[PDB]
């Protein structure tokens, strides 16, 4: 599925070497100039399972539904042993996001009404809005979003155009804050998805907020293997340093 937009963008073709091994895309939005820059425009419109980057909105939804309160984000670990040790304990919003603990977000979804969620995705324009596929519709399932839409949503959230509480947004933003300096705030969320037993869907979405601007971005990777959140973030970090933002 494909996101249709005839928005203008600066071409970022010389980012191609960063995507060696991948069908990848990089979208930047410059809040002040109100301007997109894109490596690989066709790939920037292709919709893919957002995977773990969906946790961001799943969190905003749980807040809005008073499923999460500002001083109540803690969830009990039910004692199931996972392949990654960070998951094998109680979590709060911050840790759940830092370690990408799926069960935290699967509990959030389990307690939201599918129809409230459908309504949210309609409001926020979350890609194809297909949550019909399975229970974990955001994991290599029916729900798909493009790198450019990932940027539009972050921008819309941060410019308070989503009907979510400002403190809800602040909490969610804090949970994905990777670096906090005098001169910038650096926020992001990774995503990995497996198809055909290979890491084939890599996301890193976020933004850098400086003292006079905010540069929202999304990097997406598609490839035979090693297309993962970590690689996507590594690629994004290189690109962002080279534009001199991080
Ligand atoms: C979100 O994307 C989560 N991903 C998965 O559950 C997942 C994986 C997977 C691949 C490799 C290792 C662990 C899980 N394959 O398909 C899916 C749907 C979690 N977030 C990821 C991230 O990149 O931030 C992980 C790798 C931490 S798991």
PDB file of C-alpha atoms and ligand atoms in Angstrom:
ATOM      1  CA  UNK A   1       0.000   0.000   0.000  1.00  0.00           C
ATOM      2  CA  UNK A   2       1.076   3.527  -0.851  1.00  0.00           C
ATOM      3  CA  UNK A   3       0.706   6.954   0.663  1.00  0.00           C
ATOM      4  CA  UNK A   4      -0.398   9.507  -1.923  1.00  0.00           C
ATOM      5  CA  UNK A   5       0.920  13.046  -1.623  1.00  0.00           C
ATOM      6  CA  UNK A   6       2.204  15.588  -4.094  1.00  0.00           C
ATOM      7  CA  UNK A   7       4.008  17.559  -1.404  1.00  0.00           C
ATOM      8  CA  UNK A   8       7.197  19.352  -2.484  1.00  0.00           C
ATOM      9  CA  UNK A   9      10.546  18.133  -1.106  1.00  0.00           C
ATOM     10  CA  UNK A  10      14.287  18.807  -1.383  1.00  0.00           C
ATOM     11  CA  UNK A  11      15.914  15.743  -2.994  1.00  0.00           C
ATOM     12  CA  UNK A  12      18.396  13.922  -0.757  1.00  0.00           C
ATOM     13  CA  UNK A  13      19.927  11.519  -3.318  1.00  0.00           C
ATOM     14  CA  UNK A  14      23.462  11.681  -1.992  1.00  0.00           C
ATOM     15  CA  UNK A  15      22.363   9.804   1.144  1.00  0.00           C
ATOM     16  CA  UNK A  16      22.275   6.673  -1.090  1.00  0.00           C
ATOM     17  CA  UNK A  17      25.648   5.343   0.121  1.00  0.00           C
ATOM     18  CA  UNK A  18      24.283   5.122   3.714  1.00  0.00           C
ATOM     19  CA  UNK A  19      21.695   2.642   2.534  1.00  0.00           C
ATOM     20  CA  UNK A  20      24.176   0.181   1.018  1.00  0.00           C
ATOM     21  CA  UNK A  21      22.505  -3.243   1.159  1.00  0.00           C
ATOM     22  CA  UNK A  22      18.992  -1.758   1.526  1.00  0.00           C
ATOM     23  CA  UNK A  23      15.862  -0.448  -0.183  1.00  0.00           C
ATOM     24  CA  UNK A  24      15.702   2.372   2.284  1.00  0.00           C
ATOM     25  CA  UNK A  25      14.347   5.828   2.741  1.00  0.00           C
ATOM     26  CA  UNK A  26      15.074   8.939   4.809  1.00  0.00           C
ATOM     27  CA  UNK A  27      12.523  11.684   5.333  1.00  0.00           C
ATOM     28  CA  UNK A  28      13.347  14.948   7.186  1.00  0.00           C
ATOM     29  CA  UNK A  29      10.859  17.692   8.016  1.00  0.00           C
ATOM     30  CA  UNK A  30      12.216  21.101   8.976  1.00  0.00           C
ATOM     31  CA  UNK A  31       9.565  22.703  11.179  1.00  0.00           C
ATOM     32  CA  UNK A  32      10.736  26.286  10.801  1.00  0.00           C
ATOM     33  CA  UNK A  33      11.079  26.270   6.997  1.00  0.00           C
ATOM     34  CA  UNK A  34       8.133  23.866   6.726  1.00  0.00           C
ATOM     35  CA  UNK A  35      10.018  21.721   4.239  1.00  0.00           C
ATOM     36  CA  UNK A  36      10.550  18.050   3.593  1.00  0.00           C
ATOM     37  CA  UNK A  37      13.789  16.527   2.426  1.00  0.00           C
ATOM     38  CA  UNK A  38      13.678  12.959   1.151  1.00  0.00           C
ATOM     39  CA  UNK A  39      16.086  10.245   0.152  1.00  0.00           C
ATOM     40  CA  UNK A  40      14.217   7.757  -2.033  1.00  0.00           C
ATOM     41  CA  UNK A  41      10.814   9.338  -2.470  1.00  0.00           C
ATOM     42  CA  UNK A  42       9.174   6.188  -3.857  1.00  0.00           C
ATOM     43  CA  UNK A  43      10.351   4.205  -0.845  1.00  0.00           C
ATOM     44  CA  UNK A  44       9.277   7.071   1.477  1.00  0.00           C
ATOM     45  CA  UNK A  45       5.594   6.504   0.373  1.00  0.00           C
ATOM     46  CA  UNK A  46       5.584   2.692   0.645  1.00  0.00           C
ATOM     47  CA  UNK A  47       3.619   1.565   3.641  1.00  0.00           C
ATOM     48  CA  UNK A  48       5.144  -1.004   5.976  1.00  0.00           C
ATOM     49  CA  UNK A  49       4.241  -2.469   9.371  1.00  0.00           C
ATOM     50  CA  UNK A  50       5.396   0.389  11.766  1.00  0.00           C
ATOM     51  CA  UNK A  51       6.115  -2.303  14.278  1.00  0.00           C
ATOM     52  CA  UNK A  52       7.518  -1.091  17.543  1.00  0.00           C
ATOM     53  CA  UNK A  53       7.220   2.520  16.373  1.00  0.00           C
ATOM     54  CA  UNK A  54       3.470   2.052  16.894  1.00  0.00           C
ATOM     55  CA  UNK A  55       4.083   1.929  20.642  1.00  0.00           C
ATOM     56  CA  UNK A  56       4.304   5.735  20.601  1.00  0.00           C
ATOM     57  CA  UNK A  57       0.613   6.073  19.637  1.00  0.00           C
ATOM     58  CA  UNK A  58      -0.537   3.053  21.544  1.00  0.00           C
ATOM     59  CA  UNK A  59       0.822   4.975  24.584  1.00  0.00           C
ATOM     60  CA  UNK A  60      -0.963   8.254  23.671  1.00  0.00           C
ATOM     61  CA  UNK A  61      -4.145   6.209  23.266  1.00  0.00           C
ATOM     62  CA  UNK A  62      -3.824   4.497  26.623  1.00  0.00           C
ATOM     63  CA  UNK A  63      -3.303   7.926  28.236  1.00  0.00           C
ATOM     64  CA  UNK A  64      -6.295   9.445  26.530  1.00  0.00           C
ATOM     65  CA  UNK A  65      -8.407   6.464  27.643  1.00  0.00           C
ATOM     66  CA  UNK A  66      -7.150   7.001  31.249  1.00  0.00           C
ATOM     67  CA  UNK A  67      -5.699   3.526  31.051  1.00  0.00           C
ATOM     68  CA  UNK A  68      -2.357   5.218  31.850  1.00  0.00           C
ATOM     69  CA  UNK A  69      -2.090   8.075  34.345  1.00  0.00           C
ATOM     70  CA  UNK A  70       0.863  10.500  34.605  1.00  0.00           C
ATOM     71  CA  UNK A  71       1.997   8.961  37.957  1.00  0.00           C
ATOM     72  CA  UNK A  72       0.757   5.454  37.112  1.00  0.00           C
ATOM     73  CA  UNK A  73       2.583   3.884  34.162  1.00  0.00           C
ATOM     74  CA  UNK A  74       3.816   0.760  35.983  1.00  0.00           C
ATOM     75  CA  UNK A  75       2.863  -2.732  34.796  1.00  0.00           C
ATOM     76  CA  UNK A  76       3.380  -6.086  36.569  1.00  0.00           C
ATOM     77  CA  UNK A  77       5.607  -8.667  34.859  1.00  0.00           C
ATOM     78  CA  UNK A  78       3.500 -11.885  34.644  1.00  0.00           C
ATOM     79  CA  UNK A  79       6.691 -14.035  34.965  1.00  0.00           C
ATOM     80  CA  UNK A  80       7.051 -15.268  31.341  1.00  0.00           C
ATOM     81  CA  UNK A  81      10.749 -15.678  30.404  1.00  0.00           C
ATOM     82  CA  UNK A  82      11.738 -13.877  27.164  1.00  0.00           C
ATOM     83  CA  UNK A  83      14.867 -14.190  24.900  1.00  0.00           C
ATOM     84  CA  UNK A  84      15.853 -10.637  25.950  1.00  0.00           C
ATOM     85  CA  UNK A  85      16.542 -10.129  29.663  1.00  0.00           C
ATOM     86  CA  UNK A  86      15.460  -6.473  29.897  1.00  0.00           C
ATOM     87  CA  UNK A  87      11.874  -7.633  29.299  1.00  0.00           C
ATOM     88  CA  UNK A  88      11.904 -10.064  32.231  1.00  0.00           C
ATOM     89  CA  UNK A  89      10.825  -7.548  34.895  1.00  0.00           C
ATOM     90  CA  UNK A  90       8.247  -4.954  35.908  1.00  0.00           C
ATOM     91  CA  UNK A  91       8.124  -2.000  33.544  1.00  0.00           C
ATOM     92  CA  UNK A  92       7.038   1.614  33.473  1.00  0.00           C
ATOM     93  CA  UNK A  93       6.487   3.785  30.382  1.00  0.00           C
ATOM     94  CA  UNK A  94      10.148   4.850  30.200  1.00  0.00           C
ATOM     95  CA  UNK A  95      11.672   1.309  30.509  1.00  0.00           C
ATOM     96  CA  UNK A  96       9.006  -0.277  28.311  1.00  0.00           C
ATOM     97  CA  UNK A  97       9.930   2.196  25.597  1.00  0.00           C
ATOM     98  CA  UNK A  98      13.697   2.085  26.174  1.00  0.00           C
ATOM     99  CA  UNK A  99      13.752  -1.740  26.032  1.00  0.00           C
ATOM    100  CA  UNK A 100      10.839  -2.005  23.567  1.00  0.00           C
ATOM    101  CA  UNK A 101       8.946  -4.441  25.776  1.00  0.00           C
ATOM    102  CA  UNK A 102       6.131  -5.731  23.528  1.00  0.00           C
ATOM    103  CA  UNK A 103       4.051  -7.101  26.397  1.00  0.00           C
ATOM    104  CA  UNK A 104       3.635  -3.671  27.926  1.00  0.00           C
ATOM    105  CA  UNK A 105       2.052  -2.466  24.733  1.00  0.00           C
ATOM    106  CA  UNK A 106       0.114  -5.670  24.145  1.00  0.00           C
ATOM    107  CA  UNK A 107      -1.524  -5.090  27.521  1.00  0.00           C
ATOM    108  CA  UNK A 108      -2.384  -1.532  26.494  1.00  0.00           C
ATOM    109  CA  UNK A 109      -3.974  -2.740  23.295  1.00  0.00           C
ATOM    110  CA  UNK A 110      -5.769  -5.605  25.033  1.00  0.00           C
ATOM    111  CA  UNK A 111      -7.621  -3.110  27.224  1.00  0.00           C
ATOM    112  CA  UNK A 112      -8.523  -0.552  24.552  1.00  0.00           C
ATOM    113  CA  UNK A 113     -11.721  -1.017  22.496  1.00  0.00           C
ATOM    114  CA  UNK A 114     -10.869  -1.895  18.872  1.00  0.00           C
ATOM    115  CA  UNK A 115     -13.401   0.747  17.798  1.00  0.00           C
ATOM    116  CA  UNK A 116     -11.914   3.509  19.992  1.00  0.00           C
ATOM    117  CA  UNK A 117      -8.579   2.567  18.378  1.00  0.00           C
ATOM    118  CA  UNK A 118     -10.066   2.550  14.869  1.00  0.00           C
ATOM    119  CA  UNK A 119     -11.428   5.996  15.643  1.00  0.00           C
ATOM    120  CA  UNK A 120      -8.017   7.185  16.851  1.00  0.00           C
ATOM    121  CA  UNK A 121      -6.248   5.917  13.712  1.00  0.00           C
ATOM    122  CA  UNK A 122      -8.843   7.623  11.585  1.00  0.00           C
ATOM    123  CA  UNK A 123      -8.231  10.897  13.497  1.00  0.00           C
ATOM    124  CA  UNK A 124      -4.439  10.712  13.332  1.00  0.00           C
ATOM    125  CA  UNK A 125      -4.361   9.252   9.776  1.00  0.00           C
ATOM    126  CA  UNK A 126      -2.309   6.254  10.732  1.00  0.00           C
ATOM    127  CA  UNK A 127      -1.393   4.813   7.335  1.00  0.00           C
ATOM    128  CA  UNK A 128      -3.893   2.340   5.943  1.00  0.00           C
ATOM    129  CA  UNK A 129      -5.704   2.104   9.312  1.00  0.00           C
ATOM    130  CA  UNK A 130      -6.069  -1.695   8.815  1.00  0.00           C
ATOM    131  CA  UNK A 131      -6.311  -3.265  12.277  1.00  0.00           C
ATOM    132  CA  UNK A 132      -8.354  -6.206  10.975  1.00  0.00           C
ATOM    133  CA  UNK A 133      -5.494  -8.676  10.412  1.00  0.00           C
ATOM    134  CA  UNK A 134      -4.711 -10.093  13.870  1.00  0.00           C
ATOM    135  CA  UNK A 135      -4.654  -9.146  17.560  1.00  0.00           C
ATOM    136  CA  UNK A 136      -1.119  -7.715  17.200  1.00  0.00           C
ATOM    137  CA  UNK A 137      -2.048  -5.898  14.020  1.00  0.00           C
ATOM    138  CA  UNK A 138       0.996  -3.619  14.367  1.00  0.00           C
ATOM    139  CA  UNK A 139       3.519  -6.507  14.140  1.00  0.00           C
ATOM    140  CA  UNK A 140       4.123  -7.521  10.506  1.00  0.00           C
ATOM    141  CA  UNK A 141       0.355  -7.692  10.176  1.00  0.00           C
ATOM    142  CA  UNK A 142      -2.388  -5.587   8.549  1.00  0.00           C
ATOM    143  CA  UNK A 143      -1.421  -2.067   9.769  1.00  0.00           C
ATOM    144  CA  UNK A 144       1.072  -0.275   7.521  1.00  0.00           C
ATOM    145  CA  UNK A 145       2.523   3.223   7.461  1.00  0.00           C
ATOM    146  CA  UNK A 146       5.017   5.106   5.192  1.00  0.00           C
ATOM    147  CA  UNK A 147       8.181   6.912   6.369  1.00  0.00           C
ATOM    148  CA  UNK A 148       6.693  10.251   5.324  1.00  0.00           C
ATOM    149  CA  UNK A 149       3.485   9.620   7.309  1.00  0.00           C
ATOM    150  CA  UNK A 150       5.615   8.643  10.344  1.00  0.00           C
ATOM    151  CA  UNK A 151       7.108  12.147  10.136  1.00  0.00           C
ATOM    152  CA  UNK A 152       3.716  13.862   9.644  1.00  0.00           C
ATOM    153  CA  UNK A 153       2.362  12.190  12.790  1.00  0.00           C
ATOM    154  CA  UNK A 154       5.329  13.063  15.003  1.00  0.00           C
ATOM    155  CA  UNK A 155       5.084  16.666  13.731  1.00  0.00           C
ATOM    156  CA  UNK A 156       1.324  16.723  14.338  1.00  0.00           C
ATOM    157  CA  UNK A 157       1.744  15.288  17.819  1.00  0.00           C
ATOM    158  CA  UNK A 158       4.539  17.706  18.800  1.00  0.00           C
ATOM    159  CA  UNK A 159       2.730  20.741  17.265  1.00  0.00           C
ATOM    160  CA  UNK A 160      -0.283  19.720  19.384  1.00  0.00           C
ATOM    161  CA  UNK A 161      -2.598  18.977  16.433  1.00  0.00           C
ATOM    162  CA  UNK A 162      -3.590  15.576  17.893  1.00  0.00           C
ATOM    163  CA  UNK A 163      -6.406  15.667  20.456  1.00  0.00           C
ATOM    164  CA  UNK A 164      -4.096  14.141  23.101  1.00  0.00           C
ATOM    165  CA  UNK A 165      -3.204  15.890  26.394  1.00  0.00           C
ATOM    166  CA  UNK A 166      -0.008  17.974  26.378  1.00  0.00           C
ATOM    167  CA  UNK A 167       1.308  16.192  29.482  1.00  0.00           C
ATOM    168  CA  UNK A 168       0.448  12.848  27.895  1.00  0.00           C
ATOM    169  CA  UNK A 169       2.584  13.903  24.946  1.00  0.00           C
ATOM    170  CA  UNK A 170       5.279  15.165  27.308  1.00  0.00           C
ATOM    171  CA  UNK A 171       5.324  11.796  29.110  1.00  0.00           C
ATOM    172  CA  UNK A 172       5.483   9.822  25.862  1.00  0.00           C
ATOM    173  CA  UNK A 173       8.202  12.150  24.558  1.00  0.00           C
ATOM    174  CA  UNK A 174      10.237  11.758  27.760  1.00  0.00           C
ATOM    175  CA  UNK A 175      10.010   7.944  27.392  1.00  0.00           C
ATOM    176  CA  UNK A 176      11.602   8.107  23.932  1.00  0.00           C
ATOM    177  CA  UNK A 177      14.138  10.849  24.751  1.00  0.00           C
ATOM    178  CA  UNK A 178      17.536   9.502  23.816  1.00  0.00           C
ATOM    179  CA  UNK A 179      19.618  12.537  24.514  1.00  0.00           C
ATOM    180  CA  UNK A 180      19.065  15.759  26.361  1.00  0.00           C
ATOM    181  CA  UNK A 181      21.594  18.527  25.990  1.00  0.00           C
ATOM    182  CA  UNK A 182      21.611  22.310  26.414  1.00  0.00           C
ATOM    183  CA  UNK A 183      21.725  22.661  22.659  1.00  0.00           C
ATOM    184  CA  UNK A 184      19.270  19.892  21.673  1.00  0.00           C
ATOM    185  CA  UNK A 185      16.708  17.270  22.594  1.00  0.00           C
ATOM    186  CA  UNK A 186      16.972  14.057  20.620  1.00  0.00           C
ATOM    187  CA  UNK A 187      13.923  11.799  20.585  1.00  0.00           C
ATOM    188  CA  UNK A 188      13.409   8.475  18.801  1.00  0.00           C
ATOM    189  CA  UNK A 189      11.909   5.004  18.523  1.00  0.00           C
ATOM    190  CA  UNK A 190      13.248   1.945  16.663  1.00  0.00           C
ATOM    191  CA  UNK A 191      11.335  -0.824  14.961  1.00  0.00           C
ATOM    192  CA  UNK A 192      12.246  -4.280  13.709  1.00  0.00           C
ATOM    193  CA  UNK A 193      10.054  -6.779  11.908  1.00  0.00           C
ATOM    194  CA  UNK A 194      10.744 -10.292  10.723  1.00  0.00           C
ATOM    195  CA  UNK A 195       9.453 -11.813   7.574  1.00  0.00           C
ATOM    196  CA  UNK A 196      10.623 -15.111   6.107  1.00  0.00           C
ATOM    197  CA  UNK A 197      12.738 -15.664   9.247  1.00  0.00           C
ATOM    198  CA  UNK A 198      14.828 -12.558   8.427  1.00  0.00           C
ATOM    199  CA  UNK A 199      15.022  -9.035   9.820  1.00  0.00           C
ATOM    200  CA  UNK A 200      13.466  -7.251   6.864  1.00  0.00           C
ATOM    201  CA  UNK A 201      11.710  -4.169   8.184  1.00  0.00           C
ATOM    202  CA  UNK A 202      13.760  -1.573  10.046  1.00  0.00           C
ATOM    203  CA  UNK A 203      12.435   1.695  11.469  1.00  0.00           C
ATOM    204  CA  UNK A 204      13.929   4.614  13.238  1.00  0.00           C
ATOM    205  CA  UNK A 205      11.616   7.556  13.748  1.00  0.00           C
ATOM    206  CA  UNK A 206      11.941  10.664  15.861  1.00  0.00           C
ATOM    207  CA  UNK A 207      13.099  14.221  15.912  1.00  0.00           C
ATOM    208  CA  UNK A 208      15.833  16.584  17.010  1.00  0.00           C
ATOM    209  CA  UNK A 209      14.644  19.752  18.754  1.00  0.00           C
ATOM    210  CA  UNK A 210      17.166  22.578  18.887  1.00  0.00           C
ATOM    211  CA  UNK A 211      16.947  26.009  20.421  1.00  0.00           C
ATOM    212  CA  UNK A 212      15.180  27.498  17.382  1.00  0.00           C
ATOM    213  CA  UNK A 213      13.857  24.569  15.358  1.00  0.00           C
ATOM    214  CA  UNK A 214      12.709  20.921  15.294  1.00  0.00           C
ATOM    215  CA  UNK A 215      13.784  18.494  12.589  1.00  0.00           C
ATOM    216  CA  UNK A 216      11.518  15.446  12.441  1.00  0.00           C
ATOM    217  CA  UNK A 217      12.749  12.401  10.653  1.00  0.00           C
ATOM    218  CA  UNK A 218      12.006   8.782   9.694  1.00  0.00           C
ATOM    219  CA  UNK A 219      14.463   6.234   8.349  1.00  0.00           C
ATOM    220  CA  UNK A 220      13.082   3.009   6.932  1.00  0.00           C
ATOM    221  CA  UNK A 221      14.933  -0.110   5.822  1.00  0.00           C
ATOM    222  CA  UNK A 222      13.904  -3.010   3.670  1.00  0.00           C
ATOM    223  CA  UNK A 223      16.397  -5.750   2.829  1.00  0.00           C
ATOM    224  CA  UNK A 224      17.057  -9.478   2.786  1.00  0.00           C
ATOM    225  CA  UNK A 225      18.364  -9.475   6.346  1.00  0.00           C
ATOM    226  CA  UNK A 226      19.821  -6.967   8.870  1.00  0.00           C
ATOM    227  CA  UNK A 227      17.040  -4.538   8.086  1.00  0.00           C
ATOM    228  CA  UNK A 228      16.411  -3.628  11.710  1.00  0.00           C
ATOM    229  CA  UNK A 229      15.720  -0.718  14.075  1.00  0.00           C
ATOM    230  CA  UNK A 230      19.336  -0.666  15.258  1.00  0.00           C
ATOM    231  CA  UNK A 231      20.776  -0.351  11.748  1.00  0.00           C
ATOM    232  CA  UNK A 232      18.067   2.217  10.922  1.00  0.00           C
ATOM    233  CA  UNK A 233      19.107   4.299  13.917  1.00  0.00           C
ATOM    234  CA  UNK A 234      22.784   3.964  13.066  1.00  0.00           C
ATOM    235  CA  UNK A 235      22.005   5.191   9.532  1.00  0.00           C
ATOM    236  CA  UNK A 236      19.856   8.005  10.863  1.00  0.00           C
ATOM    237  CA  UNK A 237      22.506   9.120  13.364  1.00  0.00           C
ATOM    238  CA  UNK A 238      25.143   9.353  10.634  1.00  0.00           C
ATOM    239  CA  UNK A 239      22.821  11.329   8.412  1.00  0.00           C
ATOM    240  CA  UNK A 240      21.836  13.646  11.247  1.00  0.00           C
ATOM    241  CA  UNK A 241      25.447  14.360  12.252  1.00  0.00           C
ATOM    242  CA  UNK A 242      26.265  15.127   8.619  1.00  0.00           C
ATOM    243  CA  UNK A 243      23.495  17.765   8.568  1.00  0.00           C
ATOM    244  CA  UNK A 244      24.946  18.785  11.926  1.00  0.00           C
ATOM    245  CA  UNK A 245      22.010  18.203  14.251  1.00  0.00           C
ATOM    246  CA  UNK A 246      23.390  15.603  16.643  1.00  0.00           C
TER     247      UNK A 246
HETATM  248  C1  LIG B   1       9.309  -3.901  17.864  1.00  0.00           C
HETATM  249  O1  LIG B   1       9.596  -3.690  16.688  1.00  0.00           O
HETATM  250  C2  LIG B   1       9.642  -5.191  18.537  1.00  0.00           C
HETATM  251  N1  LIG B   1       9.957  -6.118  17.459  1.00  0.00           N
HETATM  252  C3  LIG B   1       9.523  -7.382  17.439  1.00  0.00           C
HETATM  253  O2  LIG B   1       8.845  -7.856  18.337  1.00  0.00           O
HETATM  254  C4  LIG B   1       9.855  -8.207  16.236  1.00  0.00           C
HETATM  255  C5  LIG B   1      11.029  -8.885  15.852  1.00  0.00           C
HETATM  256  C6  LIG B   1      12.249  -9.017  16.511  1.00  0.00           C
HETATM  257  C7  LIG B   1      13.411  -9.067  15.757  1.00  0.00           C
HETATM  258  C8  LIG B   1      14.664  -9.203  16.356  1.00  0.00           C
HETATM  259  C9  LIG B   1      14.762  -9.287  17.730  1.00  0.00           C
HETATM  260  C10 LIG B   1      13.600  -9.244  18.486  1.00  0.00           C
HETATM  261  C11 LIG B   1      12.349  -9.105  17.888  1.00  0.00           C
HETATM  262  N2  LIG B   1      10.788  -9.465  14.636  1.00  0.00           N
HETATM  263  O3  LIG B   1       9.448  -9.151  14.232  1.00  0.00           O
HETATM  264  C12 LIG B   1       8.851  -8.382  15.170  1.00  0.00           C
HETATM  265  C13 LIG B   1       7.435  -7.924  14.938  1.00  0.00           C
HETATM  266  C14 LIG B   1      10.800  -4.895  19.508  1.00  0.00           C
HETATM  267  N3  LIG B   1      11.452  -3.672  19.089  1.00  0.00           N
HETATM  268  C15 LIG B   1      12.654  -3.912  18.325  1.00  0.00           C
HETATM  269  C16 LIG B   1      13.460  -2.680  17.987  1.00  0.00           C
HETATM  270  O4  LIG B   1      14.154  -2.710  16.940  1.00  0.00           O
HETATM  271  O5  LIG B   1      13.393  -1.675  18.739  1.00  0.00           O
HETATM  272  C17 LIG B   1      13.378  -5.011  19.109  1.00  0.00           C
HETATM  273  C18 LIG B   1      14.417  -5.678  18.199  1.00  0.00           C
HETATM  274  C19 LIG B   1      14.084  -4.492  20.365  1.00  0.00           C
HETATM  275  S1  LIG B   1      12.068  -6.139  19.562  1.00  0.00           S
END
